Amino acid sequence: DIVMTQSPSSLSASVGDTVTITCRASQDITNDLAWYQQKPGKAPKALIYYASNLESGVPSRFSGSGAGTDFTLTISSLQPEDFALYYCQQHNNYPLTFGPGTKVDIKRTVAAPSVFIFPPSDEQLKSGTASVVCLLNNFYPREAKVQWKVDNALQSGNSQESVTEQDSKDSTYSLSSTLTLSKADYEKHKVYACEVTHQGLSSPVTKSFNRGEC
Amino acid sequence: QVQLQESGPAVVQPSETLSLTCAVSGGSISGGYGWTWIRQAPGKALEWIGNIYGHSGSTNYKSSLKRRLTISTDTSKNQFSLKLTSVTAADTAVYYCARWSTADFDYWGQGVLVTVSSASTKGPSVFPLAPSSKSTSGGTAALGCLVKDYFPEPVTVSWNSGALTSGVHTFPAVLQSSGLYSLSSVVTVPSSSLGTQTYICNVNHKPSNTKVDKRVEPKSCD
């Protein structure tokens, strides 16, 4: 299978800007490369085919170029309806494959997240499961990494994350990370910590609590 | 012009068969085009499932799915269709039908969400996310509600019957490995208001006809 990658994961832009996003193919695909736009809740819409051809009914402020392994989508004089997700797609060979997507953002100044951690509530603990919650509030840009550590042992595969859309009034994001353990395993450990990596932080920040200490 | 519309069930029990149909208008299903199924799982890139070509009948399949997948056309209804057997939780996604024409997908359906879960309708448990005593030190307190183990979507959350809107973030729901949904709703307030203002989340889950109000109480050490 041909692997498509895209850069950046999200791009900060303002109305009227000219922005360029990048696509890379793991092999030479010549010019069998298309670009699509997707808005929230809607199906993708084709924008560019053969790396450079404007699809019918698409504004000419969309252009693209490239051959072989590296491709660009450029939007000149960006309009409000252009804040959306953008995907590339190769058709050089079966296993038609898409890139992970680039999200075009409303630009604002960098804002580090405020981090808060919540132990499971008393009532849930009576139930028989434990949910530990880590909130990252009001940050920008969108890329954030959350790692769970239980008594300094890095967790994996027992957490889920959720992110809001870009806030309509201040242009920030928020994220929740929920670590799920059984009650019996939760009661075998002391220190619950989430560690947050983000561009607005000089170094990863930790928020933790000790079980049974107020 | 050319229009595609998906239809199919919203919930498939694990290991049952997922069946979908795309009805095509404005063009013949026997045209030399690639009638394609593509899906998008929560937080994942679009994934090409496969296609059938209208005129030749040639079918192209994703290798890992080939034992489970059949794609076909029906000329009497001008449709094409997708069957995928032995369905697991990895198969929950929005499914799109689309037309491949030479160099892009130039027409698309609307998408249909298909969820794999053996759950029946069930109202949520609602747990407080109270601010720790320590966490209030900077002058802002984060508090919230965890609404857990419900089915199906959606739930609504308000704070103090809708008098509190500033600083509220209600997160999109996530499907847990159990097949039940969970979300959280949070709000930041001033620390000094924790002793004066009362904070209650109101959760409504109409499919189960459940209304829960949860008082979120500040923690105290002494």
Numbering used by the authors:
A (entry chain L): 1 to 214
B (entry chain H): 1 to 222
From the article:
We solved a 2.3 Å crystal structure of unliganded RM20J Fab and a 3.9 Å cryoEM structure of RM20J Fab bound to the BG505 SOSIP Env trimer. Together these structures revealed the RM20J Fab binds to an epitope on a single gp120 protomer with 982 Å2 of buried surface area (BSA). The CDR-H1 and CDR-H2 make contact with the C2 region of gp120 including residues N289 and T290. A glycan at position N289 would directly clash with both the CDR-H1 and CDR-H2 of RM20J. When compared to 10A, a previously characterized 241/289 glycan hole targeting NAb isolated from a BG505 SOSIP.664-immunized rabbit, RM20J binds to an epitope biased more towards 289 and away from 241 in the 241/289 glycan hole, revealing subtle differences in the recognition of the epitope. Despite binding to the BG505 SOSIP trimer with high affinity, RM20J was not able to neutralize the autologous BG505.T332N pseudovirus. Comparisons between the glycosylation profiles of the BG505 viral Env and the SOSIP.664 trimer revealed differences in the glycoforms present at positions N355, N406, and N411 with more complex glycans being found on the viral Env that could hinder the ability of RM20J to bind on the surface of the virus and, therefore, render it incapable of neutralization.
The HIV-1 envelope glycoprotein (Env) is the sole target for neutralizing antibody (NAb) responses. The development and structural determination of soluble native-like Env trimer mimics, particularly ones based on the SOSIP technology, has provided a platform for structure-based immunogen design. Here, we describe a detailed characterization of neutralizing and non-neutralizing mAbs isolated from two rhesus macaques (RMs) previously immunized with the BG505 SOSIP.664 trimer. We therefore selected three Fabs (RM20J, RM20F, and RM20E1) that bound to different epitopes for high-resolution structural determination.
